[PDB]
Write a protein that binds this ligand. Structure first.
Ligand SMILES: OC[C@@H]1O[C@@H](O[C@@H]2[C@@H](O)[C@H](O)[C@H](O[C@@H]3[C@@H](O)[C@H](O)[C@H](O[C@H]4[C@H](O)[C@@H](O)[C@@H](O[C@H]5[C@H](O)[C@@H](O)[C@@H](O[C@H]6[C@H](O)[C@@H](O)[C@@H](O[C@H]7[C@H](O)[C@@H](O)[C@@H](O)O[C@@H]7CO)O[C@@H]6CO)O[C@@H]5CO)O[C@@H]4CO)O[C@H]3CO)O[C@H]2CO)[C@@H](O)[C@H](O)[C@H]1O
Ligand SMILES: OC[C@H]1O[C@H](O[C@H]2[C@H](O)[C@@H](O)[C@@H](O[C@H]3[C@H](O)[C@@H](O)[C@@H](O)O[C@@H]3CO)O[C@@H]2CO)[C@H](O)[C@@H](O)[C@@H]1O
Ligand SMILES: OC[C@H]1O[C@H](O[C@H]2[C@H](O)[C@@H](O)[C@@H](O[C@H]3[C@H](O)[C@@H](O)[C@@H](O)O[C@@H]3CO)O[C@@H]2CO)[C@H](O)[C@@H](O)[C@@H]1O
Ligand SMILES: OC[C@H]1O[C@H](O)[C@H](O)[C@@H](O)[C@@H]1O
Ligand SMILES: OC[C@H]1O[C@H](O)[C@H](O)[C@@H](O)[C@@H]1O
Ligand SMILES: OC[C@H]1O[C@H](O)[C@H](O)[C@@H](O)[C@@H]1O
Ligand SMILES: OC[C@H]1O[C@H](O)[C@H](O)[C@@H](O)[C@@H]1O
Ligand SMILES: OC[C@H]1O[C@H](O)[C@H](O)[C@@H](O)[C@@H]1O
Ligand SMILES: OC[C@H]1O[C@H](O)[C@H](O)[C@@H](O)[C@@H]1O
Ligand SMILES: OC[C@H]1O[C@H](O)[C@H](O)[C@@H](O)[C@@H]1O
Lengths: 729, 712
């Protein structure tokens, strides 16, 4: 139990200082080897005091030496001294400094970044800070307000390059730690901390010194579901079950345990992938989309309200989902944080080194700190975070919010070769996880429409799908747009496939399904919504019937298009937002509605559509676009539709089931017109008759038949605002 | 449930990081990246079995439990430190597509810390096999080296004098009188000589693992310099006296020991790393580590599977691929944290600026910048410059390659990277030899090349000034031969720089008249003076301090004999030049105005000609003189007369002061440099006092002088 420090002197010599802890004080043995430069003996002026402890010949006269002792129970300190030869001349380090050594704390190691436990039991701390030239470690014990212990780090011993580091014999009696950088006494949160404390707003958080217990994953295995056979369901951990109607105990609602308790509800809809909203720790004021930390889940989502309980609960939820065959996808915000320009907002890395982690003055019209995503240090932080969330929490994929922002360089420019995205795409550990680019940004600055790079690996959320479907149902779009979106949006995913198009008609933000058919005013023109004849809720029977038909049409288009349908939380049960387009106004999910006939219809229709997708995997769950010989476009009576005619809001798809076991053709009619229209069914071989499976103008018993039979070349009468699906048998 | 070593050892899943064998929890965790491999197995050898080229044990890897993403991994409980390991990968063999998988090959992990193939330098394997089976060393659960409190010197780079040295050649000659010639330990007993020579930094020529017999099977040549690396995490085990003892661990420790001793004597260590290519060569070369794991990832390939050749050595390392970037940064961090290296010099560093094929619009966006195109902000150099650890070490770059890319003054630097100033070399070689139109360029060289480094935000000490290196003429050959003599290399004298900018000082060859020999001595001292008075970091190759000669051969990469050895017996014969060089280095150290942290300003530095204040910058000028204010010397006047004519140069008029001679390369030794150790220094000064009293100095042709302003 000792530590050596070999100081190079300024007179071509060496000074070896060995610090050994006592079984309680400390013993510091100074040894000057060599000769010539010290001809005549020298004295150890410890801080230049009236003492000096003259060095006596210790080894054969070649090695002069002295020994000092320091009392026990003394907090870590620094022994600073000079050497004076027998002529009055002083002797200093080669940096023209007084030989300074630590007592009570070892040198430490530069890796791993963060807090590590060594084989002996010593706790290693390592933190990167290029801007700072003075770093100190604060250790807080159980309540503390002020540090229970403060350890300044010597810039010469406790530093390798730009990584400050220090080892401690033990941390007994201490529960958390923090870093002070530059000289400002504000504690800082270690970026690489895996366990953290509770936020306290000036802002304050401390990394816990406890190590997360080893988690027994048992036989847990990644579902590894093919991207094509994916039906996503976005969910907010808090709002999903925090309502008392969910029937969960308090402190179990709104948590990961509550999320896992509804795996049967998830399975009932045919869902096999839940897309959680950001689970990183976040400021309560700004919301989940402004994270402070990137290595643990938020403690509000744990039953006990702690970060360790949060880790355990989230791992349990992932285990339950994996054993139930459902993948877990995390929405991750790596484009900005909740930290502020001022010193009160600074918590984690705006203080440690904000020249590396953040862009100069951020961007225009945005106070939120914009991360320097393409700076190598930030690249490493983000990549380590992703690897931690994959290897540790067994996450199946990530949906990168504000993904376009990740392509911008330090100066706010647009990089032609974004290094961070390239690193993410070709990370060996992450090669099997799904990566999805989400253009929507919580900020107030829309970036640009541009060609996000994918390497045939990135999926994308297709907002164009939402806009086009909404417009078509609103009668302000050409049928060519609906044709493009139904066939997998090949204009955008030509080189990837339909499966890489994450379709959606309603998001956590904006208007919900029941709000796209009820709320349509001047301010909501951006949502491309239609009030169906009367703004706000109403009692007009015709209007309500039209709204029900519109909801059915939205779900039908979502689940019959080529791609991955992404179902927002509450869409299945009419979770109204009261006409607000802000995600912050969304509330807890009212589960009672699950016993209604309206929600019965919605959930049954969604389940039927998912079952149709599963059964006819050769049509909807394809890795490649449908051939341009098994798709035909027809109008009122088996005729060329008016692609360029804006007034024609009717269209028909005929899909030839390529029988490369027999397969049945499909015929889908979309009618957004305010008036009915005839539909001439295609021709079928002798003995085959169309089966009317979907008709959105009927009541629940018959709305989605698993059946009515129709001979070939017949003429159906599509009612206004309806979708019809037939399948040859 | 599975067991590896006849049931004794247990086999678990493991974890994918860190890559390479790692001692952990009473066992060893192996992890290796391979994207194209459909199957993989871990092959364990015992040293005797590896000698026989037989696998002691083979643990197959399940693609379900022993593969996370593109990283195969497996954990084995037990005491495996005394065995060696490799991998056997099964995939597609398709040279046209860039795949080379073959189960008959056992490959060495790129992250292996020691590659055990042979023990003795230049001794083939059992049967003349120059390419015997190689394996990697399995780590111990603890470190077995005492650093003795070693701390990083962190000398400011302006205070560096760099000594490029070959580890084997430094002590391999019989005249070294060391216990182990040609090893790290053998070199440890000469760091005292280096310290007394004035050096405080040693640039080791490639000490990474390499095969010295790769040129030996065909032909009968050696690979002396070692610019073809097998393993990058591993030191050369044939440069250690231990050899393959304790599975190479001893060799590792030996290298560490050398470093430690260098730091005990106040000498920083800079490793010469060669990341731009590998010993595997082109498709026709051996498959050792990278080609058998992922050729399409680790190498630059044209669309038809051909190997891009920008290094000139057969293949090009895909430096800017993300995986290769991570590998290179990890290797450098390992050499800095584990082996306590102070800096790196990158061979053909410009190859690290050329982009990879991943950004071809075919791969990204699926359909229509290309492979090998130099980049403005290469990702690898960005990762090195802004690395938490590597950002604060020396980062010297040889800014060019064999593909025609030349980036001196333009290497993407982030205001961090230094460079081998080849323009300084050319300009100084051309001025000191008497060439027209190089007075202004020479003056710029003396000032740290502000026209190259000042605009970009770099300082004078980011320029690594050098006149001679391992490749090219030595300092003595630079003044003895007009043209190269490379017939011994075997390639019909087609090797090495053809534009040497050298001058035989009259007659050619080592057999010349007395006047030519004295002129050569003058020229050697002039080169050293120019190197030691310039702003920047002076770098010189080993042997230039005593006049090492390679017989006119300016490319001796394949000679394991005395032509590349430090001649300790010939050092004593030419101890006058060694004394002059040591005194010049000490003089540079003492002067406050030579190792400047910023470019010289007109306030401190004044330019003169044959008369003060009237420099001649014309194309016919061959004289450059200046005076520099000095906080310790008062003022120093330096003058170079590269003309073939003597000149009585007037000195600046400083009322109440006199110029006292210090250095004159024309004087006979020891009067070429005046020190108090000469009992008759005062008499020597008095014999020229009649010139110095009228502010004059008589200079021979091709000679330099340094004077100090003393009160009088
Ligand atoms: O970046 C460094 C740079 O240069 C420094 O100094 C240079 C230094 O790096 C080198 O020594 C350099 O030498 C080069 C070679 O590097 C390079 O090869 C070059 O050009 C040719 C060369 O003519 C051939 O090598 C050519 O084809 C060969 C393959 O490349 C090679 O892989 C070889 O592979 C194996 C071969 O199949 C086989 O013969 C085998 O040998 C035996 C085995 O025992 C076994 O197979 C048995 O069964 O039988 C065989 C014997 O038959 O081993 C071979 C490899 O070990 O196959 C081809 C040969 O047929 O490729 C290259 C293409 O470029 O030629 C020389 C020229 O010098 O030059 C130095 C210059 O200085 C520094 O100066 C500098 O600082 C630095 O920047
Ligand atoms: O340069 C002409 C000039 O000087 C002559 O003396 C010597 C030159 O000063 C000197 O440079 C050298 O010329 C050699 C070149 O430096 C070098 O490229 C070499 O490889 O070839 C040249 C010589 O072969 O040598 C000359 C003398 O030989 C000469 O004395 C003056 O009259 C003349 O004005
Ligand atoms: O004195 C400080 C000054 O020193 C250096 O400037 C000198 C140049 O190094 C040197 O080349 C020379 O420049 C002259 C050209 O050679 C000549 O062709 C002509 O056109 O005039 C030039 C300058 O007038 O002399 C200058 C000093 O006169 C150094 O480069 C500067 O950074 C530094 O400020
Ligand atoms: O989006 C569909 C449009 O393009 C198509 O290739 C067809 O010509 C027709 O369906 C329409 O013109
Ligand atoms: O098929 C309807 C349309 O879908 C697509 O967007 C393609 O352009 C083509 O398939 C057609 O124009
Ligand atoms: O990118 C391809 C586009 O046109 C094609 O012919 C496909 O049939 C369709 O799925 C897509 O719209
Ligand atoms: O899937 C059928 C495909 O055939 C086409 O020639 C193109 O590849 C694409 O436009 C189309 O989707
Ligand atoms: O390509 C031109 C340059 O190439 C090389 O790197 C040489 O070192 C240099 O002398 C030459 O001028
Ligand atoms: O100066 C070094 C010489 O050898 C190198 O390997 C370069 O490829 C060449 O350009 C240069 O002339
Ligand atoms: O032809 C092989 C040549 O390759 C390189 O570019 C070296 O600069 C040169 O010294 C060597 O002879």
């Amino acid at each position: 139990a000792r530590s050596c420090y070999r100081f190079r002197t300024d007179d071509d010599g060496v000074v070896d200082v060995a610090v050994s802890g006592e079984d309680g004080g400390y013993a510091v043995s100074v040894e000057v080897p060599g000769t010539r430069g010290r001809e005549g003996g020298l004295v150890l002026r410890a801080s230049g005091s009236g003492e000096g402890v003259p060095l006596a010949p210790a080894a054969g006269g070649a090695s002069l030496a002295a020994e000092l002792s320091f009392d026990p129970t003394r907090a870590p300190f620094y022994l600073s001294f000079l050497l004076t030869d027998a002529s009055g001349a002083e002797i200093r380090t080669h940096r023209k400094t007084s030989f300074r050594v630590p007592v009570g704390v070892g040198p430490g190691s530069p890796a791993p970044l963060g807090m590590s436990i060594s084989g002996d039991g010593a706790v290693n701390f390592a933190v990167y800070s290029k801007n700072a030239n003075a770093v100190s470690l604060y250790l807080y014990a159980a309540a503390g307000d002020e540090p229970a212990l403060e350890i300044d780090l010597d810039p010469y011993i406790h530093r390798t390059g730009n990584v400050w580091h220090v080892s401690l014999a033990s941390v007994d009696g201490y529960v958390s730690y923090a870093f002070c950088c530059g000289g400002i006494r504000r504690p800082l949160l270690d970026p690489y901390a895996k366990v953290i404390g509770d936020f306290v707003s000036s802002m304050r958080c401390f990394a816990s010194l406890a190590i997360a217990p080893s988690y027994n994953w048992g036989r847990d295995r990644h579902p590894r579901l093919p991207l094509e056979k994916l039906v996503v369901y976005r969910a907010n951990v808090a709002l999903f079950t925090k309502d008392r109607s969910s029937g969960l105990p308090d402190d179990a609602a709104g948590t990961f345990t509550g999320l896992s308790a509804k795996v049967e509800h998830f399975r009932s809809l045919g869902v096999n992938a839940i897309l959680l909203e950001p689970v990183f720790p976040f400021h309560q004021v700004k919301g989940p989309y402004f994270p402070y930390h990137f290595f643990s889940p938020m403690n509000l989502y744990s039953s006990k309200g702690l970060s360790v309980s949060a880790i355990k609960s989230m791992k349990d939820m992932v285990r339950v989902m994996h054993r139930n065959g459902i993948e877990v996808l995390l929405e991750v915000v790596f484009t900005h944080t909740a930290e502020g320009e001022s010193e009160c907002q600074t918590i984690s890395m705006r203080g440690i080194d904000n020249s590396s982690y953040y862009i100069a003055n951020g961007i225009a019209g945005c106070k939120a700190s914009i991360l320097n995503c393409n700076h190598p240090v930030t690249q490493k932080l983000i990549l380590d975070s992703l690897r931690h969330w994959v290897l540790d929490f067994h996450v199946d994929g990530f949906c990168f919010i504000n993904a376009p922002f990740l392509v911008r360089g330090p100066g706010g420019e647009y990089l032609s070769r974004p290094p961070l995205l390239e690193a993410i795409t070709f990370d060996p550990v992450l090669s099997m996880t799904k990566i999805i680019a989400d253009p929507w940004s919580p900020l107030d600055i829309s970036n640009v429409q541009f060609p996000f790079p994918h390497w045939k690996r990135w999926a994308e959320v297709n907002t164009r799908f939402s806009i086009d479907v909404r417009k078509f149902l609103k009668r302000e779009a050409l049928i060519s747009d609906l044709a493009t979106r139904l066939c997998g949006s090949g204009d955008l995913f030509s080189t990837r496939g339909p499966a890489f198009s994450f379709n959606h008609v309603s998001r956590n933000s904006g208007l919900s399904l029941v709000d796209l058919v009820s709320f349509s005013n001047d301010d909501l023109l951006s949502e491309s919504s239609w009030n169906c004849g009367e703004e706000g809720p109403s009692e007009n029977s015709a209007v309500l019937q039209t709204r029900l038909r519109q909801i059915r049409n939205f779900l039908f288009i979502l689940f019959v298009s080529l791609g991955v349908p992404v179902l927002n939380m509450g869409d299945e049960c009419g979770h109204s937002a009261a006409g607000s387009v802000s995600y912050k106004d969304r509330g807890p999910l009212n589960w009672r509605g699950m016993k209604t006939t309206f929600v019965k219809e919605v959930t049954g229709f969604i389940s039927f559509l998912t079952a149709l997708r599963s059964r006819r995997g050769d049509i909807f769950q394809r890795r490649e676009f449908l051939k341009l010989e098994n798709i035909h476009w027809y109008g009122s009576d088996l005729c060329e539709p008016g692609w360029d005619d804006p007034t024609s809001n009717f269209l028909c798809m005929h899909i030839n089931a390529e029988v490369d076991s027999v397969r049945g053709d499909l015929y889908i009619c979309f009618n957004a017109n305010e008036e009915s229209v005839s539909a001439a069914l295609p021709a079928l071989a002798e003995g085959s008759v169309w089966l009317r499976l979907v008709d959105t103008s009927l009541a629940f018993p018959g709305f989605f038949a698993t059946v009515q039979q129709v001979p070939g070349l017949s003429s159906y009468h599509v009612e206004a605002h309806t979708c019809v699906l037939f399948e040859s048998k | 449930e599975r067991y590896a070593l006849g049931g004794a050892c247990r086999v678990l899943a493991g974890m994918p990081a860190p890559l390479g064998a790692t001692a952990l929890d009473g066992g060893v965790n192996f992890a290796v990246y391979s994207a194209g491999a459909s199957a993989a197995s871990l092959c364990l050898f015992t040293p005797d079995d590896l000698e026989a080229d037989e696998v002691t044990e083979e643990v197959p890897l399940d693609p379900l439990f022993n593969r996370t993403g593109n990283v195969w991994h497996v954990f084995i409980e037990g005491e495996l430190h005394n065995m060696l390991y490799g991998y056997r990968f099964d995939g597609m063999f398709a040279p046209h597509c860039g795949q080379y998988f073959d189960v008959s090959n056992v490959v060495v992990d790129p992250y292996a810390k020691a590659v055990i193939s042979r023990g003795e330098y230049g001794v083939p394997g059992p049967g003349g096999d120059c390419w015997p089976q190689m394996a990697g060393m399995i780590p111990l659960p603890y470190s077995t080296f005492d650093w003795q409190g070693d701390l990083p010197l962190r000398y400011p780079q302006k205070d560096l004098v760099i000594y490029e040295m070959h580890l084997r050649g430094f002590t391999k000659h019989s005249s070294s009188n060391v216990e182990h010639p040609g090893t790290y330990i053998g070199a440890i007993s000469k760091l005292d000589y280096l310290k007394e020579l004035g050096v405080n930094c040693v640039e080791l020529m490639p000490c990474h693992e390499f095969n010295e017999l790769e040129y030996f099977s065909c032909s009968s040549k050696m690979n002396f310099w070692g610019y073809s690396t097998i393993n990058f995490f591993s030191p050369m085990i044939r440069y250690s006296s231990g050899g393959i003892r304790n599975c190479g661990r001893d060799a590792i420790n030996e290298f560490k020991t050398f470093v430690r001793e260098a730091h005990k004597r106040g000498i920083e260590v800079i490793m010469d790393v060669v990341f731009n290519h590998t010993a595997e060569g082109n498709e026709k070369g051996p498959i050792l580590s990278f080609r058998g794991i992922d050729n399409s990832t680790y190498y630059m390939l044209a669309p038809k599977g051909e190997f891009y050749n920008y290094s000139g050595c057969g293949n090009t390392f895909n430096c800017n691929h993300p995986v290769v970037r991570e590998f290179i940064v990890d290797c450098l961090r390992y050499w800095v944290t584990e082996m306590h290296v102070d800096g790196f010099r990158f061979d053909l560093a410009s190859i690290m600026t050329r982009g990879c094929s991943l950004w071809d619009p075919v791969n990204v966006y699926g359909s229509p910048t290309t492979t090998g195109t130099p980049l403005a902000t290469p990702p690898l150099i960005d990762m090195i410059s802004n690395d938490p650890i590597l950002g604060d070490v020396k980062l010297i770059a040889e800014a060019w390659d064999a593909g025609g890319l030349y980036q001196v003054g333009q290497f993407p630097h982030w205001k961090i990277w230094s460079e081998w100033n080849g323009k300084y070399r050319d300009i100084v070689r051309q001025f000191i030899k008497g060439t027209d139109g190089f007075a202004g360029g020479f003056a710029e060289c003396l000032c740290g090349s502000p026209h190259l480094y000042q605009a970009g935000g770099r300082k004078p000490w980011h320029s690594i000034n050098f006149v001679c290196a391992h490749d090219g003429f030595t300092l003595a050959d630079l003044v003895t031969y007009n043209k190269k003599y490379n017939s011994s290399n075997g390639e019909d004298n087609r090797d090495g720089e053809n534009h040497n900018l050298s001058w035989n000082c009259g007659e050619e060859g080592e057999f010349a008249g007395l006047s030519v020999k004295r002129l050569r001595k003058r020229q050697m001292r002039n080169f050293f003076v120019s190197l030691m008075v310039s702003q920047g970091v002076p770098m010189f190759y080993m042997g230039d301090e005593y006049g090492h000669t390679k017989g006119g051969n300016n490319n001796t990469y394949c000679h394991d004999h005395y032509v590349n050895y430090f001649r300790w017996d010939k050092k004593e014969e030419s101890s006058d030049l060694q004394r002059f060089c040591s005194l010049m280095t000490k003089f540079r150290k003492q002067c406050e105005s030579l190792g400047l942290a910023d470019f010289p300003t007109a306030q401190r530095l004044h330019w003169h000609g044959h008369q003060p204040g009237k420099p001649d910058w014309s194309e016919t000028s061959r004289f450059v003189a200046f005076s520099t204010k000095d906080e310790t010397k008062g003022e120093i006047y330096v003058a170079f007369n590269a003309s073939h004519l003597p000149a009585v140069v007037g000195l600046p008029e400083r009322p109440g002061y006199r110029w006292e001679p210090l250095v004159d390369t024309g004087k006979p030794a020891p009067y070429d440099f005046l020190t108090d150790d000469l009992p008759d220094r005062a008499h020597a000064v008095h014999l020229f006092s009649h010139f110095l009293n009228s502010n004059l100095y008589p200079m021979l042709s091709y000679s330099s002088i340094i004077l100090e302003l003393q009160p009088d």
